Design a protein around this ligand. Structure first.
Ligand SMILES: Cc1nc(Nc2ncc(C(=O)Nc3c(C)cccc3Cl)s2)cc(N2CCN(CCO)CC2)n1
Ligand SMILES: CCCCCCCCO[C@@H]1O[C@H](CO)[C@@H](O)[C@H](O)[C@H]1O
Length: 333
């Protein structure tokens, strides 16, 4: 039943892992991650030892959250769990949690290299992002922090969504709006897509307020219909005092780009989050003609997020985490 574990010192703690995982090699330091080779599967994997997983109520809930989330994600364009383990033989000894994923070799900073991608290559990368987003959103989950560094790719350009840092952020998050919808991630995708087509950051704001300034120069100041939906007295009054800027014509901003790409960008980067295109709708858009397949753009099982409202003791989060470790089933090889 239980695999045989071995001990090895790695970034100044004692890691303890099943024999199947060979040649651990630190690559990052919440938790440290080593690259490794999984002899059972012939896969190169990332093994993450969680740091201080049950040191406080907050740590324990965070551990449980991360485990719950990774266990739920089962989709080609989203990072999944290959394995989860502990050296512990019972709940009473349970102090350590290790998570295992595919070892991703690069992210979308490394692929762009600040040089333009071809339009065919942007189609394939954005398609995959949207395919992953459809899945995530169908589980009633919002990513909230999509950016090139959270987008990992292999050598065949197969992409997985993972989880300056303000450049890809929807204006309503910059404003602390608090009732975010799923199209915040769509905003992020438009920013990424722009950058891939042009080789340049769309909105490289220097500071917080500068980020909003650059955003408004592209998409115009709020229209009459948007203004009706703003409950904040301070926001309305400040917005009403700005010199009204015209939304720019994206066709005369993204010069020589596929006009289908431009049309899609217009539908993603609408100031009004209620009027942004959804991921499912973006997949049906003619820009993705050569990739779109309704038979193979799957949705997720319902994801039970009720734990998030709960205030439980360290030992209760720990036992729930231990239940999740014990129930884990490896994906089909
Ligand atoms: C930090 C790092 N990650 C790499 N790949 C990763 N794949 C999966 C990872 C991972 O974190 N998964 C994961 C997640 C996402 C959540 C929970 C649990 C887990 Cl386990 S991290 C590669 C890499 N390289 C450094 C630079 N190069 C040397 C240059 O000569 C080689 C490549 N560096
Ligand atoms: C000065 C910069 C103006 C930014 C305008 C923010 C537009 C965001 O769009 C708004 O998103 C809210 C948050 O989810 C929704 O509740 C509103 O219905 C929607 O119109």
């Amino acid at each position: 039943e239980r695999p045989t574990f071995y001990r090895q010192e790695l970034n100044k703690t004692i890691w303890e892992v099943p024999e199947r995982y060979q040649n651990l090699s630190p690559v990052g330091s919440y938790g440290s991650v080593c690259a490794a080779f999984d002899t059972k599967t012939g896969l190169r994997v990332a093994v993450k030892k969680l740091s201080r997983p049950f040191q406080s109520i907050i740590h324990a809930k965070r551990t449980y959250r991360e485990l719950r989330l990774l266990k739920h994600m089962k989709h080609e364009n989203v990072i999944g769990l290959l394995d989860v383990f502990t050296p512990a033989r019972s709940l009473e000894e349970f102090n350590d949690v290790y998570l295992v994923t595919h070892l991703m070799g690069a992210d979308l900073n490394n692929i762009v290299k600040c040089q333009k991608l071809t339009d065919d290559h942007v189609q394939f990368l954005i398609y995959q992002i949207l395919r992953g987003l459809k899945y995530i959103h169908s589980a009633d989950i919002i990513h909230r922090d999509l950016k090139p560094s959270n987008l990992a790719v292999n050598e065949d350009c197969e992409l997985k969504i993972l989880d300056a840092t303000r450049w890809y952020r929807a204006p309503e998050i910059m404003l602390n709006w608090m009732h975010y919808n799923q199209t915040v991630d769509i905003w992020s995708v438009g920013c990424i897509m722009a950058e891939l087509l042009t080789g340049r950051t769309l909105f490289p704001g220097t500071d917080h307020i500068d980020q909003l300034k650059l955003i408004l120069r592209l998409v115009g100041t709020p229209g009459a219909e948007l203004l009706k939906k703003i409950s904040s007295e301070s926001a309305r009054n400040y917005i009403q005092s700005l010199t009204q800027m015209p939304k720019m014509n994206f066709a005369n901003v993204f010069i020589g780009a596929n006009p289908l790409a431009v049309d899609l960008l217009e539908k993603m980067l609408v100031l009004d989050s209620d009027k942004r295109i959804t991921a499912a709708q973006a997949l049906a858009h003619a820009y993705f003609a050569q990739y779109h397949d309704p038979d193979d753009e799957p949705v997720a099982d319902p994801y039970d997020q009720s734990f998030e409202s709960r205030d439980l003791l360290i030992d209760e989060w720990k036992s729930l985490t231990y239940d999740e470790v014990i129930s884990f089933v490896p994906p089909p090889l």
